[PDB]
Design an enzyme around this catalytic site. Structure first.
Site, mmCIF file in Angstrom:
data_model
loop_
_atom_site.group_PDB
_atom_site.id
_atom_site.type_symbol
_atom_site.label_atom_id
_atom_site.label_comp_id
_atom_site.label_asym_id
_atom_site.label_seq_id
_atom_site.Cartn_x
_atom_site.Cartn_y
_atom_site.Cartn_z
ATOM 1 N N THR A 223 54.971 10.330 37.902
ATOM 2 C CA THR A 223 56.086 9.481 38.303
ATOM 3 C C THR A 223 57.409 10.251 38.326
ATOM 4 O OG1 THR A 223 57.121 7.330 37.904
ATOM 5 C CG2 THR A 223 56.736 8.757 35.990
ATOM 6 N N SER B 206 53.072 4.823 37.523
ATOM 7 C CA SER B 206 54.415 4.278 37.649
ATOM 8 C C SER B 206 54.966 4.294 39.081
ATOM 9 C CB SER B 206 55.333 5.038 36.687
ATOM 10 O OG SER B 206 56.489 4.287 36.375
ATOM 11 N N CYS B 207 55.909 5.180 39.386
ATOM 12 C CA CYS B 207 56.463 5.219 40.736
ATOM 13 C C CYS B 207 55.571 5.968 41.721
ATOM 14 C CB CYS B 207 57.860 5.846 40.715
ATOM 15 S SG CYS B 207 59.090 4.830 39.875
ATOM 16 N N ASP C 170 52.426 -2.917 28.398
ATOM 17 C CA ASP C 170 53.366 -1.981 29.015
ATOM 18 C C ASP C 170 54.767 -2.530 28.724
ATOM 19 O OD1 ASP C 170 55.034 -0.567 30.867
ATOM 20 O OD2 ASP C 170 53.281 -0.216 32.143
ATOM 21 N N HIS D 139 52.679 2.135 28.405
ATOM 22 C CA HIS D 139 52.918 2.518 29.794
ATOM 23 C C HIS D 139 52.176 3.800 30.174
ATOM 24 C CE1 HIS D 139 54.928 2.570 33.630
ATOM 25 N NE2 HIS D 139 55.530 3.720 33.386
ATOM 26 N N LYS D 140 52.072 4.733 29.233
ATOM 27 C CA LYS D 140 51.385 5.993 29.502
ATOM 28 C C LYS D 140 49.926 5.942 29.064
ATOM 29 C CE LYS D 140 54.942 8.243 31.192
ATOM 30 N NZ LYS D 140 55.083 8.425 32.666
HETATM 31 N N1 MNN Z 1 57.461 6.473 33.153
HETATM 32 C C1 MNN Z 1 58.197 6.340 34.041
HETATM 33 C C2 MNN Z 1 59.138 6.191 35.169
HETATM 34 O O1 MNN Z 1 58.406 5.898 36.372
HETATM 35 C C3 MNN Z 1 60.154 5.059 34.896
HETATM 36 C C4 MNN Z 1 61.268 5.313 34.105
HETATM 37 C C5 MNN Z 1 62.191 4.307 33.850
HETATM 38 C C6 MNN Z 1 62.003 3.040 34.385
HETATM 39 C C7 MNN Z 1 60.891 2.778 35.179
HETATM 40 C C8 MNN Z 1 59.969 3.784 35.434
#
Ligand code: MNN
Ligand code: MNN
Lengths: 256, 256
Positions: free
Chosen positions: A10, A79-80, A206, A234-235
């Site tokens: 990400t 994520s992104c 998350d 999240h990870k």
């Molecule tokens: N992990 C990660 C990044 O994609 C992220 C960082 C901050 C807000 C949203 C997403």
């Protein structure tokens, strides 16, 4: 069955985030490529040289271009990274067996490319100690950012070990969502991105991509398959590495 | 007692190599700074822009320069980091409480700066799959290198976990020993580098900095204190993190 997984980090991160998952997938017999996108990880470019999410995706596009005819890969974006997947799918759809979203944004084809990003900013407006700056590229003002250490600790690496969090503090770099650029970008196509198989993996624990957001994405653009990992953060590639590998093995045995 | 430790990585590496040791030292109450030297880790420069070990040491020199009067630090250098320590000591000796060598080269003041490096090349001549290239900077031909993955696996990260070895494959970058430049560099001084307290830490299980070499260095330039860690490998900060932290705590309680 074995597959060739292309792991996509990400923003503000690099291939290093996959340092636990990559060897585990290889231990299952798979081929794994973990790329550093533009101005990420140890890529030589600085973010101020990048003017769009498409340019940011260059390493992925270049990698796919290098695949000999007939060779397909399974993209895995965190994520992104989902945005990099959409961009890549509209250029090399025939080389993608499937795309796996890992607590990732899930762009669609009915709305503008920034659609899910705009929604994310609504659900998670406070990025805590994250800092921002602006630079100009190709006549456009781009908002850059550097993830705050507190945000990293509490929302992104919530349950990760101190040694993993340390890597994040040492290696995360300035980056950008290129939100305003995405807003004016042509829509992702139905024939390209729309045609690929999409597997959505997430956890309701998350702390940044909250349940409201992820469940909203699932309803907005129905994935071909959804996997919910219990616990972790999240990870997931760090906190639930084994679980992610098991899921990816099933995907490899399902889509080719 | 608490101290401010400045961790210095070796060539082709970055601050990331200290990702396990840094938080452990902080858990003991110490202040820790893990720097990325020039063209290392996520530093924006490329090795071809660097023309000497002194230029390569810039981040360390700049950091020491920023220390307010009266503040001293304990430098900890791994492998080739000992050369950065010597360079720094000849400019900021008053700011160094002590220098700890971690399976590191130990320069002296009686011989040319390249002395111990030349000896190392004699003891360990085969760098396996390591690749080399040449570039020119300031009228000098410099030999650059990229550590081979097999050398990394078998000689440097011999007993490290697969996830640590993976980080090395993902993050190690092109670098240089600047051997020919060191050979023509003025000798390290007795008043500066020669005056600082030197603690030598090593393991006889190091597969690159072999016992013959390390024992030769100890006899060549007598350290103020020698600590031998049992077991582990070249990367003791990864394989014997706790042991290294215990040793550093004693150093903090001994030199200020
Ligand atoms: N992990 C990660 C990044 O994609 C992220 C960082 C901050 C807000 C949203 C997403
Ligand atoms: N680790 C590490 C490096 O300093 C290194 C790499 C190859 C030979 C000697 C030393």
């Amino acid at each position: 069955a074995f597959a060739h997984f292309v792991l996509i980090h990400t923003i503000c991160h690099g291939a290093w985030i996959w340092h636990k998952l990559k060897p585990l997938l290889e231990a299952l017999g798979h081929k794994v490529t973990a790329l550093d996108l533009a101005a990420s990880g140890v890529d030589p470019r600085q973010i101020e040289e990048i003017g769009s999410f498409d340019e940011y995706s260059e390493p992925l596009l270049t990698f796919l271009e290098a695949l000999p005819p007939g060779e397909k890969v399974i993209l895995v974006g965190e994520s992104c990274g989902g945005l990099n997947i959409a961009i890549a799918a509209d250029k090399y759809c025939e080389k993608i067996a499937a795309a796996v979203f890992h607590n990732s944004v899930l762009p669609d084809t009915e709305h503008c490319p920034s659609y899910v990003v705009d929604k994310l900013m609504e659900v998670f407006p406070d990025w805590k100690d994250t800092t921002y700056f602006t630079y100009t590229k190709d006549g456009k003002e781009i908002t850059g950012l550097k993830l705050g250490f507190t945000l990293l600790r509490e929302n992104l690496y919530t349950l990760c070990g101190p040694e993993e969090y340390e890597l994040a503090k040492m290696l995360t770099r300035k980056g950008s969502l290129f939100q305003n650029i995405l807003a004016k970008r042509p829509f992702f196509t139905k024939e390209g991105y729309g045609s690929i198989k999409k597997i959505y993996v997430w956890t309701d624990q998350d702390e940044i991509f909250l349940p409201e957001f992820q469940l909203w994405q699932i309803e907005n653009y129905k994935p071909d398959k959804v996997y919910k990992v219990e616990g972790g953060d999240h990870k997931l590639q760090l906190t639930k590495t084994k679980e992610i590998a098991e899921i990816l093995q099933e995907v490899a045995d399902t889509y080719n």
